[PDB]
Amino acid sequence: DIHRQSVGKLQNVEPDEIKELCQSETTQKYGLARRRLVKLINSRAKLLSLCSYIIETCLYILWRHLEYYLLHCTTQDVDTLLREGANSFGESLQKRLLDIESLYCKVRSRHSFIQALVRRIRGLLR
Amino acid sequence: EQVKQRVLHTDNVEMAYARQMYMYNEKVVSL
């Protein structure tokens, strides 16, 4: 959200507004504003890609840990695992993941890999 | 990107067909 919004403010770049607009960084004011906004755009892009990574990794880590912990843990743990797992990855989480993957991922990755990981997480969950 | 590449990464009958292909390869050098 802050990212699309900053991008809009940038594409619509043109004292209180100028003061608060230089405070985190008229012609030099406008240049400084372009600078700070592009900086925030980069920071957002980076936090965003780092998000993408954190999500995808966490998916891989959970998948492997759960396969090993229910399919190959010699025994409550696996049962409580299935239970709290159908509980935690309620459809809110999954639809949130697909909503994001549609929001941003289509513009940076040729593969909605998150969609696949969601499918497999469900398939081992159900 | 490497994580993603790794992600996309993640018998007797065959022995017979394989010997057959071995012979085919030899010849080429109908499956």
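The interface with chain B takes residues 53, 56-57, 60, 109, 111, 113, 117 of chain A (CB under 8 Å).
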